[PDB]
Amino acid sequence: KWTYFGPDGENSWSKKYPSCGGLLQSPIDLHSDILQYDASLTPLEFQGYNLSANKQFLLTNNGHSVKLNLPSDMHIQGLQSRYSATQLHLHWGNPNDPHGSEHTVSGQHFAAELHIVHYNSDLYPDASTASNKSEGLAVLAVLIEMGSFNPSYDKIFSHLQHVKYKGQEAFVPGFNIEELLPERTAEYYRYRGSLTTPPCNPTVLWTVFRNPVQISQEQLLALETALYCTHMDDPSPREMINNFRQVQKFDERLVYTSFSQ
Amino acid sequence: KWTYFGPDGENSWSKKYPSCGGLLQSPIDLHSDILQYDASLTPLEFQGYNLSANKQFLLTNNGHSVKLNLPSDMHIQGLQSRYSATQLHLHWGNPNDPHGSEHTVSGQHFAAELHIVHYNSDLYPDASTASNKSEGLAVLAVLIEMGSFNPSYDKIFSHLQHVKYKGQEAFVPGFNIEELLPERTAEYYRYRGSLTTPPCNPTVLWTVFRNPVQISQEQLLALETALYCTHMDDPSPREMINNFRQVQKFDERLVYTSFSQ
Numbered sequence: 081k082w083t084y085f086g087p088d089g090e091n092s093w094s095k096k097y098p099s100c101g102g103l104l105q106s107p108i109d110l111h112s113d114i115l116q117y118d119a120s121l122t123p124l125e126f127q128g129y130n131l132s133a134n135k136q137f138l139l140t141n142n143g144h145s146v147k148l149n150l151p152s153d154m155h156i157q158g159l160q161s162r163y164s165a166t167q168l169h170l171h172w173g174n175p176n177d178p179h180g181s182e183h184t185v186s187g188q189h190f191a192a193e194l195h196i197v198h199y200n201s202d203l204y205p206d207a208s209t210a211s212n213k214s215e216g217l218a219v220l221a222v223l224i225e226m227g228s229f230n231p232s233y234d235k236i237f238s239h240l241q242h243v244k245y246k247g248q249e250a251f252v253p254g255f256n257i258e259e260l261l262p263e264r265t266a267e268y269y270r271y272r273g274s275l276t277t278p279p280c281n282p283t284v285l286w287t288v289f290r291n292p293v294q295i296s297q298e299q300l301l302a303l304e305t306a307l308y309c310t311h312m313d314d315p316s317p318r319e320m321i322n323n324f325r326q327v328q329k330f331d332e333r334l335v336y337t338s339f340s341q
Numbered sequence: 342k343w344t345y346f347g348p349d350g351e352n353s354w355s356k357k358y359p360s361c362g363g364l365l366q367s368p369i370d371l372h373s374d375i376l377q378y379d380a381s382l383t384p385l386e387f388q389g390y391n392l393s394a395n396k397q398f399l400l401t402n403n404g405h406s407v408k409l410n411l412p413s414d415m416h417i418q419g420l421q422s423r424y425s426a427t428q429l430h431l432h433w434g435n436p437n438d439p440h441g442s443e444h445t446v447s448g449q450h451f452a453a454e455l456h457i458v459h460y461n462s463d464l465y466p467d468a469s470t471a472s473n474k475s476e477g478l479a480v481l482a483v484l485i486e487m488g489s490f491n492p493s494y495d496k497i498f499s500h501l502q503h504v505k506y507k508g509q510e511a512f513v514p515g516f517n518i519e520e521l522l523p524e525r526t527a528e529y530y531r532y533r534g535s536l537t538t539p540p541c542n543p544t545v546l547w548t549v550f551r552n553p554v555q556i557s558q559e560q561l562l563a564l565e566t567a568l569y570c571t572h573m574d575d576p577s578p579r580e581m582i583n584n585f586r587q588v589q590k591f592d593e594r595l596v597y598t599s600f601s602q
């Protein structure tokens with residue numbers, strides 16, 4: 081029952097999940113020495129991201145994050161296969177230290193991080209099959225800073241008190257997922273890595289957008305206080321806080337940038 | 342046996358050394374939100390650091406770092422118990438990413454880091470015995486950055502070519518080890534933590550000096566390029582680079598500082 085704190089926390093995940101001790105792990109610190117501009121990193125296009133407000137999508141507390149399931153007609157155009165959406169979720173810190181992004185930039189954490197997970201739908205039938213397989217996943221990561229209130233993220237956060245405990249599910253009306261992405265999505269970091277959670281398979285094509293988005297302190301506080309890793313009837317409740325992995329050694333990788341400066 | 346890369350790297354240390362997945366792990370990021378001035382933190386005194394130039398001290402390559410053996414009449418005064426020296430060694434990065442300290446400051450790595458390991462000789466007979474015991478160890482950590490040539494560090498670095506491979510040893514004539522300390526040693530960070538290498542026991546009283554020292558670009562390159570992890574006859578040599586642990590989570594804790602300004 082892996083966690084982010086205590087005996088089953090991240091320095092122990094390799095005991096049960098060997099790839100968490102293997103190569104090509106994520107997240108990483110994005111810093112100058114390992115950045116290289118690559119002019120072939122052309123813009124992604126986000127197709128079928130504007131989900132209908134009259135449809136509804138399943139939000140679930142899985143005991144580790146809060147996730148929204150996404151429809152497979154939603155895809156990224158621009159990679160060398162079509163990657164179709166499967167879910168998005170978040171990582172965050174806690175009310176007294178709102179600095180829980182997974183990737184860091186020049187050694188600094190952002191307040192939180194959004195991951196929109198896609199799998200190679202040209203090659204694989206679903207994300208679970210793709211996950212332990214080559215070229216299987218592609219994640220878009222958005223760095224989140226404390227700033228202005230964000231009505232688009234609130235389309236997710238306004239439901240947190242209904243998915244407070246592990247296993248709980250709620251429905252979120254459709255909205256335009258692209259509203260969760262930052263300015264100038266053409267500027268991104270790209271690298272080969274891994275799932276940042278067990279089983280940590282090294283099967284992810286990472287795209288981290290260069291620019292962060294902002295959500296407010298009160299939105300972060302709701303995210304950091306609403307949720308539990310445990311079931312509603314658990315007599316040992318555990319708050320869902322600080323659910324980010326530490327950054328990983330590079331293992332000789334570079335990170336390629338679509339921006340030269 | 343443990344390494345900083347491949348499947349025996351830091352994420353897997355806790356399989357054979359369970360304290361590497363336990364409490365109070367080091368190193369950590371030293372940042373402003375978690376610092377607190379403590380007037381109780383008076384200056385340490387370094388006694389017996391002026392090593393007889395008529396004695397010789399064993400330099401080894403142990404496959405993890407370069408280590409100089411120190412005599413037990415060398416000690417720190419100022420802690421409640423006397424802590425006697427046992428050895429010093431270093432941690433560093435690589436020429437493509439020359440930022441291999443263990444501790445970080447405000448998210449930033451220094452180029453390298455020196456540890457002068459001591460043990461509580463008032464309570465215990467030797468460092469190995471002290472290492473898994475209460476109040477067992479005390480380490481002085483000096484952060485290193487690139488700048489001026491440093492003749493005192495060259496009293497060690499000039500012997501590196503003699504300890505290129507694992508198991509090799511050189512004798513270093515006594516010199517004043519206090520020459521390796523930075524300016525204004527009254528200015529430091531103090532916290533309770535652990536060894537940064539296996540077995541990672543949570544038994545170290547850390548003192549990280551506020552101010553770094555300088556070594557030249559050529560000294561830093563020599564430290565990064567002179568050594569191998571492997572024995573001389575190993576048909577698959579491994580360079581000794583990147584021999585630092587990633588920073589650990591440190592939550593709901595303070596680092597105390599002897600300085601406020």
Ligand SMILES: NS(=O)(=O)c1ccc(C(=O)Cn2cnc3ccccc32)cc1Cl
Nearest residue numbers: 195197208211217219274275276277279
């Ligand atoms: N945080 S992260 O974005 O790196 C991430 C987090 C979870 C998953 C999953 O694919 C979760 N998951 C979904 N189906 C799975 C089957 C086996 C193992 C894990 C599985 C993928 C990713 Cl890419």
Ligand SMILES: NS(=O)(=O)c1ccc(C(=O)Cn2cnc3ccccc32)cc1Cl
Nearest residue numbers: 456458469472478480535536537538540
């Ligand atoms: N990097 S570090 O300064 O945290 C450190 C690195 C190594 C050691 C040792 O004492 C290594 N060591 C050497 N012999 C040992 C016997 C038992 C346990 C540890 C032993 C101690 C320390 Cl404190």
Ligand SMILES: [Zn+2]
Nearest residue numbers: 169171195276
């Ligand atoms: Zn994630």
Ligand SMILES: [Zn+2]
Nearest residue numbers: 430432456537
């Ligand atoms: Zn050390």
